[PDB]
């Protein structure tokens, strides 16, 4: 039982390389979330501000500039 | 030594399920990205579209407030 004992000894040594070989891809592609999506969340916030101010800027640009303008052009009266 | 293969049979078996179990999580994380990679394609457009015809109203609304604002200078002064 020399060749049988030795066989299992070299047998395990490859599957323990797969143990790293399959946690190698896992460690890498898991980092493909921690930065790629996390910053991808930020650009939404960055683009989010412009929908806050175009409403604020047009808040004065639509109401005030028409509460008095069309009042001023009441020359028909 | 006679039983030493019996102990080394289980590492030849246990390392097999660590191969079996781990690849399952590799199966899941792929669609945990791909399906999301279809979600962050629609969100940008559905968010950017609701801006791409907001400047077309921030301007054309001022067209009435500039093409008709040239008339007030005729009488105010």
């Amino acid at each position, epitope marked *: 039982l020399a060749k049988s004992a030795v066989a299992q000894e070299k047998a395990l040594k490859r599957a323990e390389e797969r143990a790293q070989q399959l946690r190698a891809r896992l460690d890498a592609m898991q980092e493909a979330q921690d930065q790629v999506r996390r910053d991808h969340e930020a650009k939404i916030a960055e683009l989010q*501000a*412009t929908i806050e*101010r175009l409403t604020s800027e047009a808040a004065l640009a639509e109401g005030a500039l028409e509460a008095a303008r069309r009042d001023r052009s009441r020359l028909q009266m | 030594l006679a039983k030493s293969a019996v102990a080394q049979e289980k590492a030849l078996k246990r390392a097999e399920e660590r191969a079996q179990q781990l690849r399952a999580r590799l199966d899941a994380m792929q669609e945990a990205q791909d399906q999301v990679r279809r979600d962050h394609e629609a969100k940008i457009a559905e968010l950017q579209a609701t801006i*791409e015809r907001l*400047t077309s109203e*921030a*301007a054309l609304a001022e067209g009435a*407030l*500039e*093409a008709a604002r040239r008339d007030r200078s005729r009488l105010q002064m």
Partner: nanobody
Framework: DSLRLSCASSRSIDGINIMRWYRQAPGKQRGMVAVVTGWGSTNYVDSVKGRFIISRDSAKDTVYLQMNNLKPEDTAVYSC?????????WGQGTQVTVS
């Protein structure tokens, strides 16, 4: 009649959501004239439909406008505009005159 305009920036390059262009009548108020955005969509103020063509370079950060076939009544005081992180930012300001 040959004329051109440009408005460059040296910092925060391409970190640009909606940014726009203005003109000022002397001693009068201020209003938009032309705009460009993230996707480069085309739209203007009604006064220049068929009059202005506006285009971007993402890298160099200097948007351009096409001014041709001018009419002496278009003269005003121009000052490019940009909004970063939701806050607006004006510059020095210039004029364009034809007469």
């Amino acid at each position: 009649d040959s004329l051109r305009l440009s408005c460059a920036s040296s910092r925060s390059i391409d970190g640009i959501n909606i940014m726009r262009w203005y003109r000022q009548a002397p001693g009068k108020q201020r209003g938009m004239v032309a705009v460009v955005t993230g996707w480069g969509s085309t739209n203007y103020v009604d006064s220049v439909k068929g009059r202005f063509i506006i285009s971007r370079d993402s890298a160099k950060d200097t948007v351009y406008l096409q001014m041709n076939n001018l009419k002496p009544e278009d003269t005003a005081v121009y000052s490019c505009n940009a909004i970063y992180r939701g806050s607006e930012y004006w510059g020095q300001g210039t004029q364009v005159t034809v007469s």
